[PDB]
Design a protein around this ligand. Structure first.
Ligand SMILES: *[C@@H]1O[C@H](CO)[C@@H](O)[C@H](O)[C@H]1NC(C)=O
Lengths: 71, 492, 99, 50, 71
C-alpha cells in the first residue's frame, strides 16, 4: 500500500502550497537519518574515498549516490 | 487600486496605437495597465470555480471493519468458502493454514483458510476528487480603475466592475462610470488544463486543513486506495487497506492499516491549494489569457478645473510601494471637483517632471480622490502636489529596477509563464517566435521529464552531462547541452 | 506485567486556540503570551503589509502565529522498555502420556 | 499580511504502520505486555524422570 | 514529518509478523511504477548500455542504481 508523492506532478502555483522548503529537504533530512544514526557508516564511506577509488572525479558520484540510495 | 494590496504585481505600458493588450491574468496576481492618453486600469484573475462540479473517484482513508468471518478446512476436504466471499463491500484473502489435530483434521499439511470482513468506510474520511468541466467553469475578472479613491481589503470599491467568464459568455463591455468602458476578451479552456486538473477534497468541516487542492489526474488515478463513485454502496479495491497475516491453524487475523490521511498529506508536497466556499470550489492558483481592450477608455475629468495649489493637505505621507513606486494620499479642501497638479522633480536644480505617473491625471471627486501612485528615478526627489511638497529619497537603483523587472520575468516563467509568452501583443519576430522557441521545448519536456522528480532533475541531468564528458565522438559531444538544459530549465 | 514506558508520540495533533499577531513592517514584531507555555507551537515570519490592512508603511510586515498543540484521544504511540525484575519467561512442558 | 494560516498534518497512524514492515507483533492481554517472538537458553535435566 | 521504516532493526521473528512478504516488494512495486508509467524514460535507459562506456562490471552497477534512485 503506497501513495506516490508530487515529486512527479508539480503542475502550477502562485497561491499557497504545502511544503516547498521541505519536499526537496525531506530527502536531505533522510540523509541526516543515514548519517546521524550511522556515524560508523559516516566513517565507512571515508575508506571509500582515500583507500580504494583513486578516481577523484568519480568519488562524488560514488558518495552522494550511495547516500541517496539509502531510503 | 487592488494591485497595491498584494506583492505579485505587473505593469504594462500602452503606446499611442496599442489599444488591444493581450494579458495573462494569473491567480493571486494583479496587472496594472498604463497607457499614454488613457486612464490606468487594474485587471486581475480573481477566482476560478464551478458550482458543484462532477465528482470523480472517491477514496477511503480510514477503514471500518466488522462482522469478521473466518472459515478453515483440511487440505483435501474441500477448501474453504464463505457466502460473504462474493458479497459487495467485502475484502477476502484465500490462504492455507497448518492443520494439526486440535483443530481436528484427519490429515496434516496446508489446509485452506479464508477471512472476510464487511470492509465499509469510516465516516468523513472520504478523499473526494472533483474535475472542472469547461462547459460550466467560471473564471472571474474584477476590473478596478484608478479612480484616485482608496479602498482597503475589508471594503469593496464602488467602481470595481466584475464580469463572470464561462463558455456561454465572450467579452464584457464594463460601464466604468465616466472613464469610458473596457473590453475583456477571455478564453475559457486555454487557462488551466482542466483535463489534468483534479480538485482533491478531504473533510472540509475539519478546521485546520486546506479545504481543497489541485492535483494531476494521472497522479490521481494511480492511487492505491479503495475507490468508488457517488451513490455506490460498496467500494472497489477495498483490499488495499485491509491486511491479513499468516493464520495459526484455525483463524487468520485481520489487521487494518488504520487511517492514511498523513500519507496523502505528505504525498501532496508542492501542490497548490484550493478553496471551498459552499457550492463553489474556488482555486488558489491558475492563469488565463484575457485580451483586454483599452478602446472605449478616456481620461476622466479633463474638463475639470485645476485645484488651488495652496489647499493641498497630505491625508497620508508618501512611502515606498514595495514595487519601486511611490504611493500617497492627499486631500484638497477648496472647490471640488478639480485636477491635481502632481509633478515630481529630480533634486539636481531641475524644475523637470520625472513623475512617471501610474495613475495619469489624478483628480479629486466630490466624494473622494487623492490616492496617487507614481514611479520615480533613484535619488532625492521632491513630489509637488501643487505647492505642497515632500522630500523623497528613492530606494531603488538605476539598473536595480531593470534587474527587478528581469527578476519578475524569470519567476514569471513558471508553468504559468511557459504558456504566457502572450503577455506582450503580437511581437512577430519577437513574441510569436517566442511561443515557437519555448512551446516545442517545454511541451516535449512535459511529455518526458513530467513525472520524474527533483532528485532526477538534479542528478540524471548531471549524469547525462557526465556522459557528455565520457563521449567518444567529438561530433556527439553536443550532449553536453543537457547540462545547460536539465540543470537550469526544470530546477525552479 | 505493566512495565515502565518511554517517549509517547501523538500521531494526530489536536490544534486549538489559533491566534495570529501581525504588525506593520516597522511597528514592533508582536509578543504573544501563547509562546511561553509548553505544547504550543509558534513561528515568526515576514509578510508584506499593505494599506488594505490599515498600515502607514509597506515592506516586510512582521507576523507570528501560535496554537496549543494538544493530542487526540487514544492517538498515542506509547513506547515501552523492559525491566528484567518483572519479566517472565513461561515454559510449559508436556510429556507423552498416550493422550 | 493578516492571518498566517496553521495546518495540522492530520493522523499519522498509517504512516507509522508503513514503518512497521518486518516487525514482530506483540500481544497485550490487559496487564501483561506479551512478546510473540524471542529466545532463551535453558537446561533440561532428565535424570529425575522415569 | 519524517519516519524511516523498521528495515534497520528487523530484529527477531518466528511467531506472527507484519507484511515482510510485501515489505521489500514495496520498492519492487515502486521501481516497476517507474518502468510501466514512464516507458519513454524506461527506453531512454538503453542509450547508456550499448552507446556509452559499456565496461562489463560497471554496466549493471550503473543501471539498477539509476533505476532505484527515483523514489
Ligand atoms: C474594516 O473597517 C473597520 C472600520 O474602521 C476597521 O476597524 C477594520 O479593521 C477593517 N476590517 C479589517 C478586517 O481589517
Amino acid at each position: 500500500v503506497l501513495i506516490p508523492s508530487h515529486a512527479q506532478g508539480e503542475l502550477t502555483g502562485r497561491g499557497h502550497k504545502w511544503l516547498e522548503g521541505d519536499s526537496l529537504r525531506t530527502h536531505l533530512t533522510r540523509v541526516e537519518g543515514w548519517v546521524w544514526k550511522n556515524r560508523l557508516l559516516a566513517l565507512a564511506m571515508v575508506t571509500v574515498v582515500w583507500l580504494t577509488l583513486e578516481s577523484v572525479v568519480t568519488r562524488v558520484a560514488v558518495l552522494v549516490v550511495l547516500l541517496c540510495l539509502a531510503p | 487600486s487592488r494591485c497595491t494590496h498584494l506583492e505579485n504585481r505587473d505593469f504594462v505600458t500602452g503606446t499611442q496605437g496599442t489599444t488591444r493588450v493581450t494579458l495573462v491574468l494569473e491567480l493571486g496576481g494583479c496587472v496594472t495597465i498604463t497607457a499614454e492618453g488613457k486612464p490606468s486600469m487594474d485587471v486581475w484573475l480573481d477566482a476560478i470555480y464551478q458550482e458543484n462540479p462532477a465528482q470523480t473517484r472517491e477514496y477511503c482513508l480510514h477503514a471500518k471493519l466488522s462482522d469478521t468471518k473466518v472459515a478453515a478446512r483440511c487440505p483435501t476436504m474441500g477448501p474453504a468458502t464463505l457466502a460473504e466471499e462474493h458479497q459487495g463491500g467485502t475484502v477476502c484473502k484465500r490462504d492455507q493454514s497448518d492443520r494439526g489435530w486440535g483443530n481436528h483434521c484427519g490429515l496434516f499439511g496446508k489446509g485452506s483458510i479464508v477471512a472476510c470482513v464487511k470492509a465499509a468506510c469510516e465516516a468523513k474520511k472520504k478523499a473526494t476528487g472533483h474535475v472542472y468541466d469547461a462547459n460550466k467553469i467560471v473564471y472571474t475578472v474584477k476590473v478596478e480603475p484608478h479612480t484616485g479613491d482608496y479602498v482597503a481589503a475589508n471594503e469593496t470599491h464602488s467602481g470595481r466592475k466584475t464580469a463572470s467568464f464561462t463558455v456561454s459568455s465572450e467579452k464584457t463591455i464594463l460601464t466604468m462610470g465616466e472613464y469610458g468602458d473596457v473590453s475583456l476578451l477571455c478564453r475559457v479552456a486555454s487557462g488551466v488544463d482542466l483535463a489534468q486538473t483534479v480538485i482533491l477534497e478531504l473533510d472540509k468541516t475539519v478546521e485546520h486543513l486546506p479545504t481543497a487542492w489541485q492535483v494531476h489526474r494521472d497522479w490521481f488515478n494511480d492511487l492505491a486506495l479503495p475507490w468508488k463513485h457517488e451513490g455506490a454502496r460498496n467500494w472497489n479495491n477495498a483490499e488495499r487497506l485491509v491486511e491479513f497475516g499468516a493464520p495459526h491453524a484455525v483463524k487468520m487475523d485481520v489487521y487494518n492499516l488504520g487511517d492514511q490521511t498523513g500519507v496523502l498529506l505528505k504525498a501532496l508536497a508542492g501542490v497548490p491549494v484550493a478553496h471551498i466556499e459552499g457550492t463553489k470550489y474556488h482555486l488558489k492558483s491558475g492563469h488565463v489569457t484575457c485580451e483586454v481592450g483599452l478602446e472605449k477608455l478616456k481620461m476622466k475629468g479633463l474638463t475639470y478645473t485645476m485645484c488651488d495649489k495652496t489647499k493641498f493637505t497630505w491625508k497620508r505621507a508618501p512611502t515606498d510601494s514595495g514595487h519601486d513606486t511611490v504611493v500617497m494620499e492627499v486631500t484638497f479642501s477648496g472647490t471640488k471637483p478639480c485636477r491635481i497638479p502632481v509633478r515630481a522633480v529630480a533634486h539636481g536644480s531641475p524644475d523637470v517632471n520625472v513623475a512617471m505617473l501610474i495613475t495619469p491625471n489624478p483628480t479629486i471627486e466630490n466624494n473622494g480622490g487623492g490616492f496617487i501612485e507614481m514611479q520615480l528615478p533613484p535619488g532625492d526627489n521632491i513630489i509637488y502636489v501643487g505647492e505642497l511638497s515632500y522630500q523623497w529619497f528613492q530606494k531603488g537603483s538605476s539598473i536595480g529596477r531593470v534587474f527587478q523587472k528581469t527578476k519578475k520575468g524569470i519567476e514569471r516563467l513558471t508553468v504559468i509563464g511557459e504558456h504566457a509568452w502572450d503577455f506582450g501583443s503580437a511581437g512577430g519576430f519577437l513574441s510569436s517566435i517566442g511561443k515557437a522557441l519555448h512551446t516545442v521545448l517545454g511541451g516535449a519536456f512535459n511529455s518526458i521529464f513530467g513525472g520524474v522528480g527533483f532528485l532526477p532533475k538534479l542528478l540524471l541531468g548531471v549524469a547525462l552531462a557526465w556522459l557528455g564528458l565520457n563521449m567518444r565522438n567529438p561530433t556527439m559531444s553536443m550532449s553536453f547541452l543537457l547540462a545547460g538544459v536539465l540543470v537550469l530549465a526544470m530546477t525552479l
